[PDB]
Each structure stands twice: as C-alpha cells, then as structure tokens.
Design a binder for this molecule. Structure first.
Ligand code: MN
Ligand code: MN
Ligand code: MN
Ligand code: MN
Ligand code: MN
Ligand code: MN
Ligand code: SM
Ligand code: SM
Ligand code: SM
Ligand code: SM
Lengths: 244, 244
C-alpha cells in the first residue's frame, strides 16, 4: 500500500483534473497501481495558479467524497504544492496554505532554472518557520544537476527530497521529452539522495501515475527495501508528522 | 504492516512495562509480528491508574526514542485508554487527556459488569463532545454478551468496536482463563460487529501481542479482506482521523 504525497487530483483548481469525472478516473488508476493514500497537493503559485484557497477546500472535500466510490480503504489527505515566492512564508506560518496532511512538512517547488542561492535562501526562510520543506521533483532544477554536494547541503539543513515516478522510468528511443530529468533522477537514486518518490499525477493522458512501475524498477535496481522506504515508509512518516 | 491502536508500552506509568528494557522488548516483539504502527494508550482511570499526565508524556517520548533502536520504520503515536468516570468528559474536551493520535477518536473502557444504561449514557456524553468513542475490548462487558441489538445501537450512535488479539485465539484445554471473552469475541466477529482488533499488550509474560496469530485466524475463518480491514484499514483510518 503506497502513499503518494504529491498529486493534482482536485478539479477546476489548476492544470490537473478539469472535472469530477476526471478526478474519479485519476483516483481509480492510482488505486489500481496499489496506492492506498493520496495527499492532495494542488498548485499554489503567484502568477499562474491563484485559485482562491476557499475554492480548493470546497472542491477537495468533494474529491474526498468521490474517493469513496473508488474504494472504501482509499484515504485522501489535504495539502498543497507551493511555488516559492516571498508572500508564501507568512501564508504558511499563519496557516492560510496547508502543509502535507497538516504535518510539519510542506511540499516546495521552484523553477527549472532558479539559481542555487535562491533555492537555498528560500528553503532557509521556510525552516525558520519550523516547517520542513520536502523539495518537489528535484530532477527539475539545473542548480542540482549532477551535484550531490548541493543536495547534501539542503538535506543537512533539514530538507527532504522527492522525485517523480515517471522520471524513474527508462528513456524512450522515439519521442522522449524528459531525457534530462530521467538522467538526473537516476543519478540521485544512485547517490542515495532521494527520500520520497511520488506521482505528481495530473491526468490520464500525459501525466498518469507511474507508481506501480516506478516501484518495480527501484526494487530491481536498488532493492525491495529501498522501494519500500521511498514509496511507503518515508511517506508514512510524512503523513504521520514524524521526522524522517 | 499492521496498526495496533491499543497498547501499554509506556514504562512506570501503569500495569504495562515497569522499565525501559521491558518497553524496548515489547516494541521488538510487536515488530516481529508485523506491526509497523503502535498507538500508546496507557491507562487513565480514577481510582487505580492516576499517573500525572506530564509524567506519561515524559516517558512516552522516551519510549519513542527507544522505538528507533528496534527499527527505523516503527511509528509510535500518542493516545490513551480512558476508563469512564464523569471527570473524564471535561478532561477530554479541554484536551488534558489525548485522543488516539490526536484524532477525533478516543479509546474508551468500562468495567466487566457496568450496566448497559451506564455504558450507553457515558458514550452519549462523549459523542456530545464531538469525540468518537472506540470501545475497548467489547468482549469484556457482560452488558454486551451475546447481544447484537445493543452493540448495533452503540455502533449506530457513532461508536466503533475493538476486540483484543488474544481473545481471537482458540480456547485451551488446560489452564484457560478467558473462555468467556474468547466465546464473546468469536460471536461478535461472526455477527460482523468488530471494527478493530488490537493487542492491549502489556508485557511478554501473560499479555503479549497476539497480532500475527490473530491475523492468520481471522484470515482463515473470515477472509483475508476482513483481516486487513480489522488489522490495517480501519486502524489506518483512525490514525489518519477519518470516519470509518
Ligand atoms: Mn501542474
Ligand atoms: Mn511541480
Ligand atoms: Mn505537482
Ligand atoms: Mn492494564
Ligand atoms: Mn482495558
Ligand atoms: Mn488496555
Ligand atoms: Sm556519493
Ligand atoms: Sm538511506
Ligand atoms: Sm446478525
Ligand atoms: Sm463490514
């Protein structure tokens, strides 16, 4: 029973599901693949994802009703994926934006080419609030490309890393769009710099969950024990508000 | 990975472990049997279990450190087993006594021969506080012996039932001390009146966890699906603060 801590399943709030039907379909697929817990982390990002918090709550609650139709033992928790801009700090401290399952952990996102010093500075200011940043899809940031020294630094301040399930997969030979993130992801896993693997699922045409598959690949390359850590135990600790 | 929502693992606080050594030994056994989550529910009972709440917290936190020695993926949550006396209501509402994992659920206990009207009255007054009572070892109460009508009533007010793992086991032919609770437990399982099975573990000489075994017996008699509900899914919902 996997716990997916990064998901876009709330409808009409961001670039995830546009309808209830689409939300129900996502949940169902996630369930097929063995996920029994999903943390909703819709986008909060000044400039492009500014849906009112009240509306996200409204729709999330509806999605939690829908989950019941998929399966009685599917647990939906609230949360958020937060794109760092300065305003975000007070919003977090005052609790106007959710942490993951109301725990100490917050899912934090940057741009592909955010300079390292900006990522670092931002993550410091969040730690100052007593909140623990889990860094969203570290494969994305150029700042961290092939750079363990920098990732260790962040982990050692008190951050934890998340990698997307789809970037654990192997590169295709025709029509690959994520060569660099797949290469980057594989490097972090080799260096043992990954705490969590999550789906970042948005839909069932382009951004599905690849959790079942990502799990079998990590099992083979890195061992069953590591797959369980990244896909179950560490997420378990996050959702239970305990330090990993 | 089972979740045990009823446990006496804090030392020098009640009739559970008397030492750290004994606490560590309990955790370890529970882990052997496949339990990955344990809710601490030490005794709060006017008249015989009156250890100051500050002291229970102090020692619980230490037990949570010890758990790390047993295994990194063992999660210890705080809670309490509450013996109903009137004072308990305000203590709960004001939060001077913990609910299970700080959820809406509280583990509630009575005496073997508490008349039904007293159990009922007490459980009403707790529901009035917005708290959901999970009834501790229902096998114990004479009021509920062979009496589905009464158990359904309670469940329908909004209570949930817990049965002890050791009372799921088969009766012995020499030196059985729990014939009646084993018979009673078996009856509730047949009538499908049990939401949760938990250990009520106190030690490793007389009151061990019988979770591994209780799980295999429920599997055989009632199906894998039911064992998972009682030993994993329903407890999962309790610890995640979601209505079962
Ligand atoms: Mn998106
Ligand atoms: Mn993102
Ligand atoms: Mn995302
Ligand atoms: Mn006891
Ligand atoms: Mn008891
Ligand atoms: Mn007990
Ligand atoms: Sm290295
Ligand atoms: Sm490691
Ligand atoms: Sm019946
Ligand atoms: Sm049932």
């Amino acid at each position: 029973g996997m716990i997916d801590i990064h998901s876009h399943i709330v409808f009409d709030v961001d670039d995830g599901p546009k309808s209830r039907e689409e939300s129900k379909a996502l949940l169902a697929e996630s369930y097929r693949q063995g996920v029994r817990t999903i943390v909703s982390t819709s986008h909060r990002r000044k400039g492009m994802f500014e849906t009112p918090e009240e509306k996200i709550a409204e729709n999330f609650l509806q999605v939690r009703e829908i989950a019941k139709e998929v399966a009685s033992d599917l647990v939906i928790a609230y949360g958020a994926e937060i794109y760092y801009t300065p305003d975000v700090l007070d919003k977090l401290e005052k609790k106007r934006i959710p942490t993951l399952n109301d725990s100490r952990y917050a899912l934090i996102e940057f741009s592909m080419n955010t300079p390292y010093r900006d990522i670092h500075s931002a993550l410091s200011k969040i730690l100052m609030l007593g909140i623990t940043p889990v860094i969203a899809h570290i494969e994305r940031y150029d700042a961290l490309e092939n750079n363990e020294k920098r990732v260790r630094e962040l982990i050692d301040m008190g951050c934890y890393t998340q990698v997307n399930s789809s970037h654990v997969l192997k590169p295709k030979l025709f029509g690959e769009r994520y060569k660099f993130m797949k290469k980057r992801a594989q490097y972090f896993l080799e260096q043992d710099l990954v705490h969590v693997i999550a789906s970042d699922m948005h839909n069932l045409d382009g951004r599905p969950p690849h959790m079942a598959e990502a799990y079998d690949l990590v099992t083979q390359k890195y061992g069953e024990a590591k797959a369980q850590e990244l896909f179950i135990d560490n997420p378990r600790k996050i959702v239970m508000d305990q330090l990993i």
